[PDB]
Amino acid sequence: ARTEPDEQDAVYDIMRATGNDWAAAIPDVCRGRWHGIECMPDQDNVYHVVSLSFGALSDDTAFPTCDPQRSYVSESLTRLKHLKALFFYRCLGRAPQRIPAFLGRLGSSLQTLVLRENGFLGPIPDELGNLTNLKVLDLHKNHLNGSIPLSFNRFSGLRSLDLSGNRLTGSIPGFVLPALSVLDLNQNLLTGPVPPTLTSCGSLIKIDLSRNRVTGPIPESQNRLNQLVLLDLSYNRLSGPFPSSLQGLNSLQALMLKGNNKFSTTIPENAFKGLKNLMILVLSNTNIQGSIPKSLTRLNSLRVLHLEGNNLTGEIPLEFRDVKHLSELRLNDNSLTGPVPFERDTVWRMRRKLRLYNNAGLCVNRD
């Protein structure tokens, strides 16, 4: 049970490129392992390297550190014909490098690729589209610029895409990945409308696009994601109106539109009817108009309701007298006008988490 010699020298190369030369002195790498390499045998009792990770992901169970001054991603990774995962976490090198194109040459086997907080520069190499068995791609928190390569549409079986915390421009990708579950692109510079192709990614359980420059409305088709648990479109430039039906989205626990300062519409009463599981609604500072509708009273699971900083008018529905479950309710900084229906139990429990200030009309009685 010994390691394929060529893979062995690739491993040596990679470890020297990273600053960890004590590996070269190790006689058989897949037998003398360190946390940060995993091997598997083939049917002729040869060990092949299957996982390679670096960095201290909080140091309890740390991976080989990198020389901050002189380390780099080694081209010798291309010799690991069986590498199924590769992981780099806060591994900082000689200069800030670009992501290398030669990573694409592991397309037969690479199933997970995580390059997280390494100060990577420049555009995402086109040839990573050649990793067509990838289920997990994460390049979160680097300094990447440019566009999301179009070739990402060849990730037919991708499970999770994290490109957040970069300077990515251009549009949301217009792919259709049937099995994609997490899409995280928040804190970038992405522009354009939300391509309606996005609602053909039915496996989606999380869409985090917040803090970009995406424009246009929410796709009306959005009803289609039955599995979506969280949706965050905060701090973009969306325009209204609210999609007529939301009722298909019966896993949605969180919807946050906060910061779309020109969203500008009403909350119709049939928008949120029957959202059993909905627990968090953040429509704050988005130029909402009209009256606060009453269906928002009968949302069984709703705990957090933020509607502050809008042009909401009218009186506070009397139904808001009988809502026992909310832990936060923000109607402050509007122009609501009437008396206040909140019952004593509610005011006492909520305390400062029920906020009603800066509403000039409001007729206050006791709280």
Partner: protein, 42 residues
């Protein structure tokens, strides 16, 4: 497929007497140790 006891023989980088020692936080997990410093098991 199974499991095996972690072998620490080369798990402390370039610290040599790298040997396995167990930890209680009671449930139990393994670590590698060399000259009083801790490292994670392969």
């Amino acid at each position: 497929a199974g499991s095996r006891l972690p072998d620490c023989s080369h798990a402390c980088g370039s610290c040599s007497p790298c040997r396995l020692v167990m930890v209680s936080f009671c449930p139990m997990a393994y670590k590698c140790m060399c000259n009083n410093k801790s490292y994670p098991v392969p």
